[PDB]
Symmetry: C2
Subunit: 169 residues, 2 copies
């Protein structure tokens, strides 16, 4: 969860509250959405939990923090249960005016298209060739690639639905 995402950052090096939030508005934003607020609040809870401490010379991960990160890591991670809202709404189109849905779908497709374009721009600019990227960069690249492939798959699906919603009426 959020604290493990934060512990991961600190596991490589100590960092200020700003360094950390800069990650969330950068590479971490490719797979985990959290506001600077939420982040500071979590960092706070983590301090009381003893998972992180403060230094002057700056947040630093503690042995407890390291232990929790490892425990999290070892736990099996599985696919979230399937309960697709878009599919659920689609099925109701047999008894509801498909108008509202069709517009809400077409709308989210365009945004998705914009988001895919954004990610592709970023990949070409900083993650075009893995072979020349550091380990940390290859990892970031992969998290970026996930949104891309999935989002693209969803757009492909959305278009298929958008088509059926016409050939039926």
């Amino acid at each position: 969860s959020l604290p493990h995402v934060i512990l991961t950052v600190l596991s490589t090096r100590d960092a200020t509250g700003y360094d950390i939030t800069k990650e969330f508005s950068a590479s971490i934003g490719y797979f985990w959405k959290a506001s600077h607020q939420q982040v500071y609040r979590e960092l706070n809870k983590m301090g009381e939990q003893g998972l992180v401490t403060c230094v002057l010379e700056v947040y630093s991960i503690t042995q407890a923090g390291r232990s929790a990160l490892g425990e999290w890591f070892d736990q099996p991670t599985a696919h979230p249960t399937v309960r697709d809202e878009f599919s659920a709404k689609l099925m109701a189109c047999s008894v509801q005016s498909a108008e509202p849905y069709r517009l809400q779908l077409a709308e989210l497709v365009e945004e998705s298209r914009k988001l895919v374009a954004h990610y592709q721009e970023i990949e070409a600019a900083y993650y075009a060739n893995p072979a020349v990227l550091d380990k940390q960069q290859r990892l970031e690249r992969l998290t970026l690639r996930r949104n891309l492939l999935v989002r693209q798959a969803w757009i492909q699906w959305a278009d298929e639905v958008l088509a059926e919603l016409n050939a039926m009426a």
Copy 2:
């Protein structure tokens, strides 16, 4: 949510508690996972809410149920916030033994492959040609297609990660 998924069924025709659960272990299972238990329990809550009633001649949707389904339908449906656990674990591979992760990933890929095969078998057998399918079938077909495209996209991604986890070590 679950009750709207159930209301949708009843919006086309009345049905017994068995007819409804049969949907969840069938086409509805393509996009919404719920146990017969959960279903019966929800049907119960819906009765007390007056969204559904009982008949002899069998559950039937009420005007309130119809109103709630419409209200649900009109509400904008958006993409769930991005907080990818697999990506989160991947990033921790820079500071953790990538061993446990790599095995948990390879494992879920094979299952995903099995699931994709399953869905493809179903599509060829009952949803191969939309043009010959009824409206209700074209809709089911589309919900089935969503798991397929997305799951396939995730497998493509997982393989990319599985590769990097080698070329780095």
